Design an enzyme around this catalytic site. Structure first.
Site, short mmCIF file in Angstrom:
data_model
loop_
_atom_site.label_atom_id
_atom_site.label_comp_id
_atom_site.label_asym_id
_atom_site.label_seq_id
_atom_site.Cartn_x
_atom_site.Cartn_y
_atom_site.Cartn_z
N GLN A 14 -3.82 -17.13 -3.69
CA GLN A 14 -4.09 -16.34 -4.88
C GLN A 14 -5.22 -16.95 -5.68
O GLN A 14 -6.07 -16.23 -6.22
CB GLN A 14 -2.85 -16.21 -5.77
CG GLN A 14 -1.87 -15.12 -5.34
CD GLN A 14 -2.58 -13.80 -5.03
OE1 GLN A 14 -3.38 -13.30 -5.83
NE2 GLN A 14 -2.30 -13.24 -3.85
N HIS A 61 0.82 -1.22 0.00
CA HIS A 61 0.00 0.00 0.00
C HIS A 61 0.85 1.26 0.00
O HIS A 61 0.83 2.04 0.95
CB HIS A 61 -0.96 -0.02 1.18
CG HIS A 61 -2.08 -1.00 1.01
ND1 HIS A 61 -2.13 -2.20 1.68
CD2 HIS A 61 -3.18 -0.95 0.22
CE1 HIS A 61 -3.22 -2.85 1.32
NE2 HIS A 61 -3.87 -2.13 0.42
N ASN A 113 -4.95 -6.42 -9.81
CA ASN A 113 -3.63 -7.08 -9.94
C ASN A 113 -3.67 -8.40 -10.72
O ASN A 113 -2.84 -8.63 -11.60
CB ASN A 113 -2.98 -7.36 -8.57
CG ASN A 113 -2.62 -6.11 -7.79
OD1 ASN A 113 -2.43 -6.18 -6.57
ND2 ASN A 113 -2.50 -4.97 -8.46
N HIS A 132 1.26 1.48 -5.69
CA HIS A 132 -0.11 0.99 -5.74
C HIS A 132 -1.09 2.10 -6.13
O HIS A 132 -2.01 1.88 -6.92
CB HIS A 132 -0.52 0.36 -4.40
CG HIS A 132 -1.98 0.04 -4.30
ND1 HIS A 132 -2.59 -0.93 -5.08
CD2 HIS A 132 -2.95 0.56 -3.51
CE1 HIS A 132 -3.88 -0.98 -4.77
NE2 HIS A 132 -4.12 -0.10 -3.82
N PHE A 180 -8.36 -16.19 -3.86
CA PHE A 180 -8.61 -14.75 -4.05
C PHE A 180 -9.33 -14.47 -5.38
O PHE A 180 -10.33 -13.74 -5.44
CB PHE A 180 -7.27 -14.01 -3.98
CG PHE A 180 -7.37 -12.51 -4.16
CD1 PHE A 180 -8.33 -11.77 -3.50
CD2 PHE A 180 -6.46 -11.85 -4.97
CE1 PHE A 180 -8.40 -10.40 -3.66
CE2 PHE A 180 -6.52 -10.48 -5.13
CZ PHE A 180 -7.49 -9.75 -4.47
N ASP A 216 -8.75 -1.23 -7.98
CA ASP A 216 -8.10 -1.60 -6.72
C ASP A 216 -7.84 -3.11 -6.70
O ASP A 216 -6.83 -3.58 -6.17
CB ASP A 216 -9.01 -1.16 -5.56
CG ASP A 216 -8.29 -0.99 -4.25
OD1 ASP A 216 -7.06 -0.78 -4.23
OD2 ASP A 216 -9.00 -0.99 -3.21
#
Ligand SMILES: COc1ccc(-c2ccn(CCC(=O)N3CCOCC3)n2)cc1OC1CCCC1
Ligand SMILES: COc1ccc(-c2ccn(CCC(=O)N3CCOCC3)n2)cc1OC1CCCC1
Ligand SMILES: [Mg+2]
Ligand SMILES: [Mg+2]
Ligand SMILES: [Mg+2]
Ligand SMILES: [Mg+2]
Ligand SMILES: [Mg+2]
Ligand SMILES: [Zn+2]
Ligand SMILES: [Zn+2]
Lengths: 322, 331
Positions: free
Chosen positions: B289, B80, B241, B84, B292, B238
């Site tokens: 991941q 953060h 990624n 970013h 996620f 946000d």
């Protein structure tokens, strides 16, 4: 003073006399009395000296030069909540922790109030409005300050609660004080009305509240009702509250006029209608709310509703009408 | 040229040529710019969209604000940080130009979304809202345990406008400032993950009833519609990624794990329960991941892709390829 405190379980306690008699410590005296009455110091192992230390510091953080939103208003809302908690329809419904939350929320709910509204703070680009992103600006601040004061020396009255109790109490108090924001009033009322229509009661006629959402909803509206209880009080008390809110409002209006701003509704001392304004307040905010509370706890609040309707008819009586 | 002075520049210019592309190499930009990716990328975007002229923003005022804003992202926070912020800004900038949204937003709405993106994590401490709540932090006390960091990012981002020669909105009208302020607050508060499930549900409802011109351009009717799309747009940025070129995604994963493990270390040191995925001693980075993507990122991006169909098809395809990468590298 001890004689006046005999009325602590009664609607319409003369809080202004309590204030005078206690050396301007109505909040401390009334909170202490109520904590003793409800045996809260024993239940939560609150050291009496810790209680008094916190209450005096809390009371110190209400502003003496703010005509309405001061320690007397706080004491009034605490005491009114205390009465509503004991309404028959709610007998044995709430836990001691929930009761503690509602009363503590009432005590801190306007602490460090500057005597101007959220909208004023937003419109004047205040530091408070900047901090809280224009959202429930003062109510967030009251909460922050009220909790922060628990950190002062020998001020942590919740020191002997369990972690879980502390967390639960903190959540409930936040939920309650945020519900005193008038921007939430119509949604609170709309939902309360729906709760009333589907309400469930035991054989003895006690309300059944089965989840946190229903329970906190009732506590939110209860303290909101207490916050909006002035017109339901004996006329001699209600007139004093009206005098104070108008003084506070007119001071805000003076600041707006000095700043070349449009003067907020009911904040212009030169173009104000006190009677008209109280009748509007009762008709559009206070009666719609209290008639709904009265529905929820029928018939517990009938005398309260009767006084409100009498006071409305009184304030309307000198306004010419077709 | 690029508002920070670097060595080289010609190389920086070559990378910035991709500022309109998904998968801009933002780490390269960060290195080439002397660790000023947010200032450089914001400068480029404001010039590209002619925002200085539209809102009469003095360029020196813009650069001063951006430098000050960038300074308030922590250099020692692995994820953060200012990179970013730059990434989310640039990703929002690309999403705004998607064909399905052509001519939909006003210049003030565009400015709001970009500004929101730039400030949306400023002064991030590298720990979660829940960590701040659990440790009785001053921030959680200030904000009553509600959207603790997101409220803070807004407050800081706005407050920095007040520093010397930093008010990039000085030549907005009173009404424009008020509108932009409200939009920016609405957008940054929507980056709170506590609001993700509700936000996605409402986005699904919007997709079910969406209206388009014959060229597939979205028709939005009111503030509610427009701010909803802007909120989800920045939330997607946000959470973008895993939709990026794999080499970028691999680096973001390394950084979020570094940050998470550091929070878990603070938790372990205080004898607290270590938060999900913050325990370096018991981690499954690759499996996490995949989880996620399956539970958060794909459900969101699949819905966005529906809204702007077929604009985001390649973003979706890349996401699925990247899921397979981390799947294939589970020990
Ligand atoms: C005795 O008179 C009043 C007593 C209390 C209120 C009142 C209104 C809303 N609350 C709830 C708390 C709140 O949120 N406020 C406080 C007032 O300013 C706005 C934010 N309380 C109003 C009263 O009358 C006003 C003066 C002209 C008529 C209206
Ligand atoms: C590349 O990896 C990630 C990149 C981004 C996120 C992520 C989650 C939620 N956001 C949205 C912003 C937010 O609200 N956060 C930030 C993370 O902590 C919670 C509050 N972003 C997660 C990532 O992975 C985590 C490591 C284990 C799997 C999850
Ligand atoms: Mg209040
Ligand atoms: Mg009526
Ligand atoms: Mg009777
Ligand atoms: Mg964030
Ligand atoms: Mg619509
Ligand atoms: Zn009040
Ligand atoms: Zn972020």
């Amino acid at each position: 003073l001890a004689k006046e405190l005999e009325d602590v379980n009664k609607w319409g306690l003369h809080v202004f006399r309590i204030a005078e008699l206690s050396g301007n410590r109505p909040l401390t005296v009334i909170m202490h009395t109520i904590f003793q009455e409800r045996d809260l110091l024993k239940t939560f192992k609150i050291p009496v000296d810790t209680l008094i230390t916190y209450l005096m510091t809390l009371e110190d953080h209400y502003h003496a030069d703010v005509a309405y939103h001061n320690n007397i208003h706080a004491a009034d809302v605490v005491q009114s909540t205390h009465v509503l908690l004991s309404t028959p329809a709610l007998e044995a419904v709430f836990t001691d922790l929930e009761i503690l939350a509602a009363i503590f929320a009432s005590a801190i709910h306007d602490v460090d109030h500057p005597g101007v509204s959220n909208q004023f703070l937003i419109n004047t680009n205040s530091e408070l409005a900047l901090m809280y992103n224009d959202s429930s600006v003062l109510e967030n601040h009251h909460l922050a300050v009220g909790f922060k004061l628990l950190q002062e020396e020998n001020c942590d009255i919740f020191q002997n609660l369990t972690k879980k109790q502390r967390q639960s109490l903190r959540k409930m108090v936040i939920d309650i004080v945020l519900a005193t924001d008038m921007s939430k009033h119509m949604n609170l009322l709309a939902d309360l009305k729906t709760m009333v229509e589907t309400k469930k009661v035991t054989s003895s006629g006690v309300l059944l509240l089965d989840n946190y959402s229903d329970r906190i909803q009732v506590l939110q509206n209860m303290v909101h009702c207490a916050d909006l209880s002035n017109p339901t009080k004996p006329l001699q008390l209600y007139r004093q509250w009206t005098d104070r809110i108008m003084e506070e409002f007119f001071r805000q209006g003076d600041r707006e006029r000095e700043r070349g701003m449009e003067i907020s509704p009911m904040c212009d001392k030169h173009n104000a209608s006190v009677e008209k304004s109280q009748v509007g307040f009762i008709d559009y905010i206070v009666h719609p709310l209290w008639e709904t509370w009265a529905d929820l706890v029928h018939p517990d609040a009938q005398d309260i509703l009767d006084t409100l309707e009498d006071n409305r008819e009184w304030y309307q009586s000198t306004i010419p009408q077709a």
